[PDB]
Symmetry: none
Subunit: 235 residues, 2 copies
């Protein structure tokens, strides 16, 4: 379709899901003519696009205010993904839903958008470049990489809260099976059609379902299957 | 500020991979990041070795103004550590500068040896224009071009000799630095280089900076600091 490039797009998205830290490159406003590298944590919004919470006094915020064009570099050796994007600050109506998902990924950030001078921005894709550990270069159109999350919001929140409240034992099984860090017990942070995030201390990790899950019942089935598994199933 | 400049240089010394952002030629108006290894030159500036066919090389050729981002390694809360953004002008070294660059850089990155003109590669120095340092608590300091780098009076043949002799004669002192410090122990550490404030160990892929108790301006002062660390039961206060 071509098959390599469809594989590449999925691999790109998996890398995007598996990380929660990126290097943002922006045009320096304070120093015209210079690019500017900064670090940002992120999660994905309902449409599968990077969502950031950035401070009004941060260089990268001033830079995006003057010129929304930027790139994000995210790592897996080693596979690497570049996103070319136009950043947009979320309208007031968009903030509640951003905040709810972002604060689940980053609970120590809670209320920062209200009490401190932080705002949510979304990176709107213009192009992606995925390079595998073997060095195969795949340039991909804007819409090829993101995958919408039909759970984002209320369905997801109920799923995550029930898992953290009533199925901590199963969560321990996932960590064991995947060989994740065990300095603290894990909690679910979020769920998408392809997998789920666990937070472990500071500390985010993505795990794939054995197959895609389009509704909460399919998610239940995958999680039960994972909890009973003796090794991580593939595909 | 004085605190800030020192802490900035400390991070620069402690790291060996940075994110270089350049003006994109392929997609004008989008800055592109790439990961580059680096060490510091005799003047304390970043020295990189980049392929004639790499995109970031074509980018720097068309516009040498760039950013280099360094930050504490493996940080899970990435905004709870210091980060340093260097704004710089990249300059390809003249033929007269190449030998001293290769000799130091190849000590830091042995696996690269003679990639310059068996392979596609040339040495470039990042000439500082401005630094933006953010501390672990989130204080922002903008620093002048010359505020952060400190020259290394050992760079080249003095250093090469001190390092070669520590590695041949004092493997035992080196293993002890490793124990005292951190620090991976499967290999067998080698000294990579020495500066007035500290020294680098390679293990084995694998670079690590360790401070002297106080700056050492001459080779007699570095021997002293290295003897003290060898006999030290715990790492001393700086
Ligand atoms: Cl930063
Ligand atoms: Cl800043
Ligand atoms: Cl650009």
């Amino acid at each position: 379709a071509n098959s390599m490039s469809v594989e590449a797009a999925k691999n790109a998205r998996e890398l995007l899901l598996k990380e929660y830290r990126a290097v943002l490159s922006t045009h320096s406003k304070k120093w015209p003519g210079f690019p500017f590298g900064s670090v940002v944590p992120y999660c994905l919004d309902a449409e599968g696009r990077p969502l950031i919470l950035i401070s009004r006094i941060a260089q990268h915020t001033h830079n995006l205010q003057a010129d929304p064009r930027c790139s994000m570099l995210v790592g897996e050796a080693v596979g690497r993904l570049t996103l070319l994007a136009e950043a947009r600050q979320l309208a007031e109506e968009e903030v509640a839903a951003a905040a709810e998902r972002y604060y689940r990924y980053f609970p120590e950030s809670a209320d920062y958008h209200r009490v401190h001078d932080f705002d949510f921005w979304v990176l709107q894709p213009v192009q992606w470049r995925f390079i595998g550990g073997f060095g195969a270069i795949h340039w991909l159109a804007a819409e090829r990489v993101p995958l919408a999350n039909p759970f984002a919001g209320e369905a997801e929140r109920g799923m995550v809260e029930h898992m953290n409240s009533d199925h901590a034992a199963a969560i321990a099984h996932y960590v064991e099976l995947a060989g994740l860090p065990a300095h603290a017990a894990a909690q679910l942070a979020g769920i998408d059609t392809e997998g789920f995030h666990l937070r472990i201390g500071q500390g985010l990790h993505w795990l794939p379902f054995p197959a895609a899950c389009g509704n909460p019942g399919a998610v239940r089935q995958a999680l039960v299957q994972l909890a009973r598994a003796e090794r991580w199933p593939t595909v």
